[PDB]
Subunit: 382 residues, 4 copies
């Protein structure tokens, strides 16, 4: 990384060590929205990491970005979650947005004055998006939106929502009917309920209801209707990389606590790491985490070099997310009974890890996508 | 075969779980509310007397029946099985090792649940390395004077008899011959100090205990001789490991049932999700492992009951079932997709409860050590 | 088990200890057909374990049967393989055969004078049997058979082959066109080639070619054409149980060698089992093997009690077969470098284990079948 | 970035594998035939001089290039990478620790393959517990007199220089300071006793060595001082672990390629088998793990080359890649169904070769022990 990029990663690490870690336990326990921490994140530039001049201060490299996201997640997964969707919307705007849209939204998004999130998932399905029921019917110079979404993260605090919806529910082929609309908080758009979650606490995830919600037709992302799927798929290069960084972040936290505790707790006359059963866990955890970060960093470099990286980003997400779950459980084992205590942090990492497996696209879907990609590519890029 | 009465008790407990436990468990468990009404119904059912024969109680069910009762309870809510586990182990220790006076003093009120008991072994400085324990009981006239501390003691507040493993001779040679078990009532100097906040196993309290100059009569000693605490506990761990294995198969049954049901209710891409191989494969693996774990458990319970050696088999049951329940709990979350993460669904609770049987009822690392040594002592499996 | 059944299991165990184990290494290495050992197996009654009076001495209980098969496999998997298909054909004859067929074949099968095997698999597919190309066209009082099978075990030494084939390739629905024929070694039926295998050595597995091979129409198993699938599916209750017993057998052998070696080999001043890394493997191996046998024995009892046991038999096969593979590799680990030497037996168990995973129906298919069964049943039988 | 010449060498080795190795490997490997022609072509290519710089040889490639060459070789046939592994490690030990005389005596003929070297550490009594080794070298005038035995020594017959770890002072205090490495030629008393029959790694011999009153000059000592054998070997194990990791990723690449190709050629139930999720999922998991393992390997190779600490990272690469190759090899067998079991297909060979990198190049149990200790010494990962 360049010195400027190294400095950014260090500022975030120091932010996590000095500001996040002292307060996270109490806030996460009470499901308190971390306003002060988020505000500091806006000040250091977290909400503009993908936004270049003239709209923002500059788009850091993807290797820098994943390190930032990892550092945040290592302190508290929810903080990285607070900017994940926002970064994806940023990227979608840059790739596909009109000049007017980019100009309208990107400058305030970069400071975090305006936050954005992604609304794809419907109550009837998050995987089978083609079956979605949310429609956007053209009426004069407006779309009239009727439907619902759920599990939408940061939905209350985000005043721009990238809504995947059916601009033509009767299109043939059906993919021509699906678009992305950039939807502000207009009448008829209700953020109807906060959903109670195992982990990812502090950040709200919500049901959305649209009852004849009118938005200008200029809300369309890009010039053409029916590009929503192709657009999303490109968005997922960044999405999958950030989720993977979230997972290596949670894994780092759990591994660090486990390794530290194994030196401080003794049994049968020695530090517990010197029992092979515990040392073996530490060796496996560290080795898999090194593999996971190595893969992540490799995928990020491919992204940065402008090479095809869609499969690689997916593999990063699959591997890191499964790895973080394994590491989290083993960190609990290393603490013995104290692993089960809410006065230690490992139980929280254990609660947080599944989010990246089931709640950021599923890993079953991710495997299906990787298999298709392997066949298309003919193997790994070696 | 289970006797008539034994089949009936299992059914009664299943019905209690379906009609009384399941409709209130979310609210109680989420609020960490002590389930006083549910536990009282368990007392009436006879749950606290399952190992207590006549003349003290209304009959000791077979071990295969006992594990099925524990499994049914845990299927509804792991914590309700936890409520009676240590009590059962103490019941057994009294029968195996107690004087006639002790058995008569405690077992009749234990069988009804009027008196509850728990086991206190774990110290803040270690639950595995018990030889290093600091709790001491020193003879002074016809009392023991107890000083020290224990922690993670389940049901310590609601239990008014505690089987306390402590050093009656800290200078013993060999050192393991200095450890005994005392049956300690709630005497002056015995403080039940605080409820420890936990990931799961909610509703049931686990506590730190502090003993300051706590006087009990020397008749509190379990058995006639000091220095047999470890031997006695080993024998108690046969019951303990089987009951923990049953907790784990019960939690597994609950997670698996929910996942299988959900996989038929939820559809994607035009069909019930079980018909996608990625999901159907998880169900097949879950169901297959669960069948393996219950088969192992029931085999070990029958060996216990046939009077055959079952110490290794009980540890195997605990190890296999607890690891299996954790695997099944996670996969049940996966089957639910995003809803697996919601506390309005039950699979997140099983996921939070499953690690308890792995790290908090003796650890699985210690359990493998014990099994390796037993395999060598035995020369392999009993075949 | 009854005393008679205990005695049978003991006779086989003693046969394995006294006769098999001294010679297996040299024979298996050279792919030598174990004629003497097979002949002894005929003499002790292995080929009539499922054949009742009046045709044979008696059908042992399924719990007895799985213990016999396990004992054989523990000495050498190939020996249990030599009687597996034969037992299934025995069972198919008893369940579905005419009185004439049963009388013709079962008495000689019970002594092993006549051996039988199952021929389902085609070169084009062993899983997708409905797509099979082998046809049996009626011409007068004969079927004329044209096609091919492959991976047919014991095909040279078996003079009766239960051939799944299409008696009506145009049937609608297509399952009405599939039958089982009991085919003797007639002209036009070539056992064309022996296939070289990783393990399962000593026993031949062959390609079969049928070129206008004529058999009497009385060769049909049962009175009706188009019952082949339903018949096979019933045959697989016994098939899956025997394969599961083969796996627990190989697992017992590998575990026993590993446990023994861990007491006899020392490093850093002590027997290697006392290193937790090795002890942990032994504990896991023993525990999983106990689970596997417990499940197997439970499924066998259900079979014997006449309760539905099809899912259970499949679960037994899946679990035991995966377990034996895991145990075999770990037995190799326990031996260190000597695990890799062909002068020790663990490499052979390692080569043999995959057979039960890929070569006795696949475990992927087995999982699909179990999922369907779980949905049909509504869960486990508890 | 790889230099021009470095990219070219990798391509040359890939082409050699595709055109020369693959068409003959089955017949040779099945017959345990020493691949003399293939190895001779490897000599001409420069394979035996990859770590030997000027003035001794035509240049030491970077470590990232080296691992890619080793991986390409192993992809074709694990045994061909094995043929040059120990030779590379000895090359490095000579460069790090040898006198000018030793370097000049051996490295020029080593670089061409005219002289081959191997490492002899493992004893019949143990390959892990090397401190317990029985091979001794006792000074007598200006000779060492060597007595003892080694086993599993790869390429012992074809290699005419053996780096022998032995006790120059069996009474040393501390005991580890009695162990040295001697560069031993094929002298009277040094018997290469027999080729050990193996599950895989065929074509290349592994042998028992027996030393009886075997005299070598004292100048055979690697370095100026006795008692540094363990320290020197640790340094050599950086190269050794990286090369073994590369063998494992190479074998994995071969198994994965075959499985992916087969999954497109074979159809069932109306489609290419990859389109059944059970198969596609295996491919996704295989490809994902392989990518992880190669990423880790290349990261560790770059650290080596940047002069950064890489001792833990090399062990991690070996552990992860070897376990990954075994998993991928089995799943490739599964993908082929029954044909996976046929010796007319190649996946059975990868399956037989993969355990070598787990149990026979230091064990993975020892490797985890080493990694745990390193993690503690370091305080975690280098991040
Ligand atoms: C909610 C709840 C409820 C209860 C309990 C726990 C919890 C969490 N337990 C306490 C429980 O039995 C205890 O946690 C375990 O004995 C493990 O103890 P430590 O936490 O001290 O692990 P400890 O500090 O011993 O071990 C930490 C880690 O090192 C490992 N380790 C330690 N020594 C080792 C060795 N020699 N070899 C290999 N690995 C080794 C452990 O396996 C673990 O991974 C208890 N107790 C009680 O007495 N009565 C009760 O009612 C309950 N109930
Ligand atoms: C806390 C939190 C936060 C968020 C989100 C979730 C959660 C829990 N998500 C929603 C998330 O992406 C969603 O849960 C997943 O897409 C999975 O969707 P379903 O729950 O609908 O699984 P679904 O019902 O699709 O699947 C259920 C199970 O079946 C499997 N399955 C389904 N179809 C299959 C197939 N064809 N093949 C194989 N297996 C198949 C799945 O893998 C899963 O195991 C979200 N969404 C969003 O739009 N914006 C957001 O901000 C967030 N944030
Ligand atoms: C084909 C082939 C080729 C070669 C070699 C092997 C093979 C099979 N090796 C030998 C190889 O390095 C050796 O096998 C390993 O060092 C393991 O040694 P043992 O077989 O003596 O295992 P050992 O007897 O040390 O161990 C047996 C089991 O116990 C475990 N164990 C032992 N001590 C332990 C501890 N303290 N803690 C935890 N677990 C422990 C091991 O991990 C293993 O599971 C070799 N050598 C050489 O010098 N030069 C060469 O060229 C080759 N090449
Ligand atoms: C040594 C030996 C001995 C015997 C046999 C094999 C071998 C190797 N078998 C044949 C064996 O039963 C056969 O190999 C299996 O049925 C698998 O068949 P294919 O190899 O055709 O796999 P196939 O080509 O069907 O499958 C290839 C891969 O795709 C997977 N797959 C295929 N369809 C799928 C689907 N719908 N969903 C998910 N995954 C799917 C498979 O699981 C496998 O991983 C046999 N047969 C016989 O009739 N008589 C005998 O005596 C013997 N004995």
């Amino acid at each position: 990384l360049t010195a400027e990029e190294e400095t950014i990663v260090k500022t975030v690490h120091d932010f996590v060590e000095k500001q996040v870690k002292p307060v996270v336990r109490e806030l996460e326990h009470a499901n308190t929205y971390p306003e002060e921490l988020i505000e500091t994140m806006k000040e250091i530039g977290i909400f503009g990491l993908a936004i270049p001049e003239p709209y923002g201060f500059g788009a850091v490299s993807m290797p820098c970005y994943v390190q930032v996201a990892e550092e945040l997640a290592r302190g508290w997964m929810s903080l990285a979650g607070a900017m994940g969707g926002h970064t994806v919307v940023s990227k979608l705007l840059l790739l596909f947005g009109t000049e007017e849209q980019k100009q309208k939204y990107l400058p305030r998004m970069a400071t975090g004055e305006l936050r954005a999130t992604m609304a794809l998932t419907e109550p009837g399905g998050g995987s089978d998006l083609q079956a979605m029921r949310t429609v956007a019917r053209r009426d004069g110079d407006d779309y009239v939106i009727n439907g619902s979404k759920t599990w939408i993260s940061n939905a209350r605090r985000s005043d721009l929502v990238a809504l995947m919806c059916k601009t033509d529910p009767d299109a043939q082929p059906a993919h021509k009917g699906v678009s992305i609309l950039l939807v502000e908080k207009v009448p008829g758009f209700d953020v109807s309920r906060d959903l109670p979650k195992l982990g990812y606490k502090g950040v709200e995830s919500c049901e959305l209801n649209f009852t004849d919600a009118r938005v200008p037709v200029s809300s369309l992302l890009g010039d053409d209707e029916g590009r929503g799927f192709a657009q999303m798929m490109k968005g997922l290069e960044v999405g999958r990389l950030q989720v993977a960084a979230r997972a290596t972040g949670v894994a780092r936290a759990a591994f660090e606590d486990a390794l530290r505790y194994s030196q401080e707790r003794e049994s049968f006359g020695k530090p517990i790491w010197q029992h092979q059963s515990v040392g073996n866990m530490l060796a496996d955890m560290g080795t898999k985490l090194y593999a996971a970060r190595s893969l992540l960093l490799s995928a990020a470099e491919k992204f940065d070099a402008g090479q095809r990286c869609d499969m690689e980003a997916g593999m990063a997400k699959l591997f890191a997310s499964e790895t973080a779950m394994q590491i989290a459980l083993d960190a609990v084992r290393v603490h013995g009974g104290y692993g089960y205590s809410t006065e230690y942090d490992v139980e929280r990492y254990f609660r947080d890890a599944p989010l990246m497996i089931v709640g950021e696209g599923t890993n079953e879907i991710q495997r299906n996508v990787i298999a298709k990609q392997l066949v298309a590519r003919g193997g790994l890029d070696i």
